[PDB]
Coordinates of C-alpha atoms in Angstrom, one line a residue:
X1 CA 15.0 6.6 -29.9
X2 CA 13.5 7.1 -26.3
X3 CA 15.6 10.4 -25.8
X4 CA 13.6 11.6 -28.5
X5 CA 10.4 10.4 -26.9
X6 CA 7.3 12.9 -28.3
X7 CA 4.4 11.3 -26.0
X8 CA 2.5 13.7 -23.9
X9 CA 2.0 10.2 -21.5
X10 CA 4.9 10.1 -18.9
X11 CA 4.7 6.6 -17.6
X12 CA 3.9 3.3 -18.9
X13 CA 2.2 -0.2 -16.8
X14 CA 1.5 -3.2 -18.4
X15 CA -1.3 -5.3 -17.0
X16 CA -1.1 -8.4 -17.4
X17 CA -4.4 -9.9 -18.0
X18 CA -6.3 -13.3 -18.8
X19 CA -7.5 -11.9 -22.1
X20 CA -3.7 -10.7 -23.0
X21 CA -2.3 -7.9 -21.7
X22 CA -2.9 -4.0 -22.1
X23 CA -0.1 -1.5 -21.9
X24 CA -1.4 1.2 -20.1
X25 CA 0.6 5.0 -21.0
X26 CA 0.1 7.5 -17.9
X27 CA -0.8 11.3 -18.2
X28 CA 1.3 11.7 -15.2
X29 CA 1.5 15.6 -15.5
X30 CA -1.8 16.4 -15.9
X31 CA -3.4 13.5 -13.3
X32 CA -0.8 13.3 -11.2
X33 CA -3.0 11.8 -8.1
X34 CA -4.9 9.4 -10.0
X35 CA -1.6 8.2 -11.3
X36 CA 0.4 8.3 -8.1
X37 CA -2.6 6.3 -6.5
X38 CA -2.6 3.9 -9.8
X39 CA 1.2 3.2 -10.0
X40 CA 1.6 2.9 -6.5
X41 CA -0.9 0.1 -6.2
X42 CA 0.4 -1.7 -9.1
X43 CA 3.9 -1.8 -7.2
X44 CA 2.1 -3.2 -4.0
X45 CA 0.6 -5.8 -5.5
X46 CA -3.0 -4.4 -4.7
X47 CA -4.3 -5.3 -8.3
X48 CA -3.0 -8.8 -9.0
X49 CA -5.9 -11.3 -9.5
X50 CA -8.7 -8.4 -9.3
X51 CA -11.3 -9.1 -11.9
X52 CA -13.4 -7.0 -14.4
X53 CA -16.7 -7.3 -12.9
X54 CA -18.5 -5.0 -15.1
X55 CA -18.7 -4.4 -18.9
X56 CA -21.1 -2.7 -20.3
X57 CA -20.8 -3.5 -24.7
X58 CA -19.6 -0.5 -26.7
X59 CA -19.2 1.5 -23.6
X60 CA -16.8 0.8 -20.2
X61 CA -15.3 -2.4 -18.6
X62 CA -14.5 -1.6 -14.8
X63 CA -12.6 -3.5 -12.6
X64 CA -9.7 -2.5 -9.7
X65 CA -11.9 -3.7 -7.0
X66 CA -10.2 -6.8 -4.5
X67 CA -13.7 -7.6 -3.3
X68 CA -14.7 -8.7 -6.8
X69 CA -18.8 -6.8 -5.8
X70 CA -17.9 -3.8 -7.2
X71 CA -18.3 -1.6 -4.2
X72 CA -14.6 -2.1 -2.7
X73 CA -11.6 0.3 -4.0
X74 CA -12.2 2.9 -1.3
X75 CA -8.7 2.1 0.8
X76 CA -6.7 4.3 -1.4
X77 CA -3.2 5.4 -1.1
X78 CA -3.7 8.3 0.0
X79 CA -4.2 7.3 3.4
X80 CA -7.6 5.8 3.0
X81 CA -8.9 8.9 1.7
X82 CA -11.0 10.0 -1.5
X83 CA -9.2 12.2 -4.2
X84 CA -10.8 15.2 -6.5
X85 CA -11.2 14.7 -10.1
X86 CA -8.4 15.6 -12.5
X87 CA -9.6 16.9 -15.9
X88 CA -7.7 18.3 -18.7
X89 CA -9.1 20.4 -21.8
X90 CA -6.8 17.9 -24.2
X91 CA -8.0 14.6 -22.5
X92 CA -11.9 13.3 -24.0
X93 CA -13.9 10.0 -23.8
X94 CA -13.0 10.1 -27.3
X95 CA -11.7 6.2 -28.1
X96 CA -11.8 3.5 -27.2
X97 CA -8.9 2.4 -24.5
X98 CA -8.9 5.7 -22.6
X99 CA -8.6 4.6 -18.7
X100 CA -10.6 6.4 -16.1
X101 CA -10.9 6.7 -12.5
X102 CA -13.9 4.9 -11.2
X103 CA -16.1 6.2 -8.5
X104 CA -19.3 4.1 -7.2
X105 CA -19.4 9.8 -5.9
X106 CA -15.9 10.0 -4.8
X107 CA -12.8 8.6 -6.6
X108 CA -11.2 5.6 -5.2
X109 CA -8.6 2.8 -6.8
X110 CA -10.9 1.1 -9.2
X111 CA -10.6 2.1 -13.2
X112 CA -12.3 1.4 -15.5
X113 CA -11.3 1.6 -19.9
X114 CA -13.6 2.8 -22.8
X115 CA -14.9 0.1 -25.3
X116 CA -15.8 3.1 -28.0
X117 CA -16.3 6.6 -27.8
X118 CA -18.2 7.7 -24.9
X119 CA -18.1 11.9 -24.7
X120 CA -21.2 11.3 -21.8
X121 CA -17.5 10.4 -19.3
X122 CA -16.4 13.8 -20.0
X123 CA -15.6 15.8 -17.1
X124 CA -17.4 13.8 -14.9
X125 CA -14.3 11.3 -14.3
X126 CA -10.5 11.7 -14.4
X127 CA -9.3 10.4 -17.8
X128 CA -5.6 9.2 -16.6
X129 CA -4.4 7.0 -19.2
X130 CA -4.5 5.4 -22.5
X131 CA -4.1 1.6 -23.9
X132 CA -1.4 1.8 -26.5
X133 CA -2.7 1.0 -29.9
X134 CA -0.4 -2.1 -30.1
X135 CA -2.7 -4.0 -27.6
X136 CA -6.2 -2.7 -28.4
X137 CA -7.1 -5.9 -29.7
X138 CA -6.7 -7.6 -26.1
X139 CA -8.8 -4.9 -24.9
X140 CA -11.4 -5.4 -27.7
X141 CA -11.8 -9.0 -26.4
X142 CA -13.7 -7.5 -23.5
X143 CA -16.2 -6.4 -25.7
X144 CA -17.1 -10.0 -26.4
X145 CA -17.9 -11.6 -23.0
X146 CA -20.8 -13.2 -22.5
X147 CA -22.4 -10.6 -19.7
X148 CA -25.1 -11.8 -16.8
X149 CA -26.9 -9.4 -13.9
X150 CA -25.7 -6.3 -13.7
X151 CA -23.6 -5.7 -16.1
X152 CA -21.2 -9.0 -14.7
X153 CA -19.1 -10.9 -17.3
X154 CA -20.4 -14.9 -17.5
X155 CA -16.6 -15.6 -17.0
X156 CA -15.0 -12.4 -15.0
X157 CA -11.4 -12.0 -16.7
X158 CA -8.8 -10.7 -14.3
X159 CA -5.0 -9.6 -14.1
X160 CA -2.1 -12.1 -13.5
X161 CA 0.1 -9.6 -12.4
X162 CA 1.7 -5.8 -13.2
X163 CA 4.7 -4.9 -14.5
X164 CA 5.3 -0.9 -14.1
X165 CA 8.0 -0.7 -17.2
X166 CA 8.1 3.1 -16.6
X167 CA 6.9 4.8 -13.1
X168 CA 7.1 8.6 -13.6
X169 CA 7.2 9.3 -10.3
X170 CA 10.7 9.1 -8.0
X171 CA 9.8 9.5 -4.9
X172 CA 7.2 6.8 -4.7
X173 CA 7.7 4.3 -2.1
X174 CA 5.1 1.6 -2.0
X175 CA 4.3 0.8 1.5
X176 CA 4.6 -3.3 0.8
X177 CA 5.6 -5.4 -2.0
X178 CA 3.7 -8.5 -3.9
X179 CA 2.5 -11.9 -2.3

């Protein structure tokens, strides 16, 4: 059982999303901002009812923006501030539902998840966690949307709501709770 836990992910976040939801598995050790920033806004409520305004077939959806333009995301937790990029010779673009940190140069809260393998990410963005293989197909749905201008989905899905079933990190306190 969990004790025995062989996962190099410490952390898991379920989003709960209108196309089903994703369960999201941190690399908490080796991104430790982008995750701090990520788990901390899931327990503030900061994602509930963002959509996915972008998704680009075969390649990314993006969302994690309150604005729904897809220029917002910049009031991170870390008061306000950009963070660096967190990369990791074990952690590729190399599947589809690996989540990244989004940034429009410098990173902020929005993510965005592979649709297929995309090695041109590599480096370039932190590669913080992974969609666990169980609910792939939810994430596949994305793939489908009917897209308009700019990349926007006809019908932009969003999330209901976040459940953190594991936050790696103890000392976290978020500075307000849901609506």
């Amino acid at each position: 059982e969990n004790l025995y836990f062989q996962g190099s992910t410490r952390g898991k976040v379920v989003l709960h999303t209108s196309l089903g939801d994703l369960d999201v598995e941190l690399w908490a050790r080796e991104c430790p901002l982008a995750c701090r920033n990520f788990v901390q806004l899931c327990l503030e409520g900061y994602y509930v009812n963002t959509i996915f305004h972008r998704v680009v077939k075969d390649f990314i959806v993006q969302g994690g923006d309150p604005t729904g333009t897809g220029r917002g995301g910049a009031d991170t937790t870390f008061d306000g501030k950009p963070f660096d990029v967190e990369t990791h010779p074990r952690l590729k673009f190399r599947y589809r539902g690996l989540v990244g940190v989004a940034n429009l140069g410098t990173n902020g809260n929005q993510f965005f998840i592979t649709l297929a393998r995309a090695d041109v990410l590599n480096n370039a963005y932190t590669l913080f966690g992974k969609v666990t293989g169980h609910t792939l197909y939810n994430l596949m749905k994305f793939n489908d949307l009917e897209v308009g201008k700019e990349d926007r989905p006809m019908t932009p899905p969003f999330i209901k709501s976040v459940d953190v079933l594991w936050n790696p990190f103890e000392d976290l306190v978020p500075r307000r709770l849901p609506d």
